[PDB]
Paper text:
Previously, we described the isolation of one such crystal protein, designated Cry51Aa2, with activity towards the hemipteran pests L. hesperus and L. lineolaris. The structure reveals an elongated predominantly β-stranded structure with similarities to other bacterial β pore-forming proteins. The structure of Cry51Aa2 closely resembles that of Cry51Aa1, which is expected as these two proteins have high sequence homology (97.7% identity).
Residue numbers in the entry:
A (entry chain A), B (entry chain A): 2 to 309
The structure:
Amino acid sequence: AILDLKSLVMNAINYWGPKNNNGIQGGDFGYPISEKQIDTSIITFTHPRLIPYDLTIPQNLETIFTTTQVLTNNTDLQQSQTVSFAKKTTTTTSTSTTNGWTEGGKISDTLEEKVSVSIPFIGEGGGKNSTTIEANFAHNSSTTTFQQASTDIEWNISQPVLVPPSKQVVATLVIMGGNFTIPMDLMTTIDSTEHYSHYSGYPILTWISSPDNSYSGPFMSWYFANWPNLPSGFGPLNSDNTVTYTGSVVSQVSAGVYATVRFDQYDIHNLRTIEKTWYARHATLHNGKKISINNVTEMAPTSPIKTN
Amino acid sequence: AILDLKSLVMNAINYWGPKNNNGIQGGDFGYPISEKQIDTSIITFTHPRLIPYDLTIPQNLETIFTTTQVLTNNTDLQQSQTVSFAKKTTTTTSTSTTNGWTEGGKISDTLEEKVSVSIPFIGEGGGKNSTTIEANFAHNSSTTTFQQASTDIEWNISQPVLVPPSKQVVATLVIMGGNFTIPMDLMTTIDSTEHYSHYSGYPILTWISSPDNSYSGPFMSWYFANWPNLPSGFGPLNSDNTVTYTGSVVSQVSAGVYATVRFDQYDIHNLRTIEKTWYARHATLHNGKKISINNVTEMAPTSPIKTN
């Protein structure tokens, strides 16, 4: 859920109050306190670290783009022609918080960063492969509301094709992509714009004002970290006197994963019939790398004998 | 357990054999094959990555070292005397494999590296703290046998002490340490010293010799990665045609975590009775950092009022 830090601070203050006065020397804060004696706006959250869980179970892809180039040789000699595709697609991510935080119900500003994520995938023959994908992720620790982000990828596939005389070669670019749900831990460090240092530094999560408002006293992170019902997601006191909270996001990513080119040869005088179909030797991944076409089609690799 | 890769390769070869001859073109390998037709010694394991799980549940410490320095002022004036401790201790780790690998029962050579590990700990008042510890870890992917390593740490604690006339101040260094069980995933990449490339590169896990031994054929990682009973710990085929295996270690670490100094004041003419006990303002961590003494003793921090 979205934890309110103002409430928890108020719960901690009201727990320590009658027992040690929150370490404040003197004063009549009238416990329990009302949310007017308090201003938690001085609390800072470190910009969150996003830790993707690395997907392990291979997924099925489907065709998200197909296009064609036509190469013709109506000459007397074998020609060397290059097939060149350049296609921009857009990887899309939408992200909701499962376990987030705010301070006094506030809604913070959506942030956006690049995250490397593991993408295990199933080639067309059912072959199993492993790659990584870099994408833009938007997140908001303060709502469950989905935050969208987008990333532009260009697929550049170029290679030479050997076209015989009076043949037509048709090159078909196919882009395979899928839909992945990546859960990520979301990591933040609770600090403050103000400290009660003096012997060593302690973030002040809130000054506690007297009911008449004349004087005040500081509420230090020490009392928050050692509060016996501090929730499960808060870490212990760091060397810093800061406290780490670890929340959660669930992200959904929709990305092209790999591209192949298929060649189909025809004789220019009957274009109804394929003479010869073959694949480019390499499929191209989202991240630009080249892998063997056997990893993603129904052909197994193959070798002759070696007679020593 | 310790998986033998020679067996699994042999199981894969004997699975594919009758079906496609392991992609080898021609030849009568007599399936099933015996372990003489095969030499898996060409298989390489990438030097393992060790991924520590970050301990979350705070632990109790005990006193692993205590020593004293005695400061005396038998002069007429307040003196400024520095107390200086330099103590070498040794962090010890012992590590056994839960899920490891070898090739044909071989026992590889124990390796040793520095790993940063999370150490949550309970101060003397029951306060909860978070630090990190860098230690040497020895591991062997091929046995369950414990591998020990050791790391030398110096504790340097120096500060000035204010000693009144005709007082004795006794400074007591206390080092608190504990015993932590860190489980770690162990990560390796199966490659080969030999490749059947030719269209793209495939590690050869083993040449398969004819029964008469005249000729042979290569067994490529493709057949291993797509073998329907490949075990659960192997990842899919990487872009590299390598296969990632992820095993496990369980490590036990015994380390000092923090040091404090307590001062006890006496009058030099009765040394049976403490006048005044107080702490150095800071405890010192294993990694050299300084944290407030309140995080690790039974004293809560404290502030006066501020009258605006």
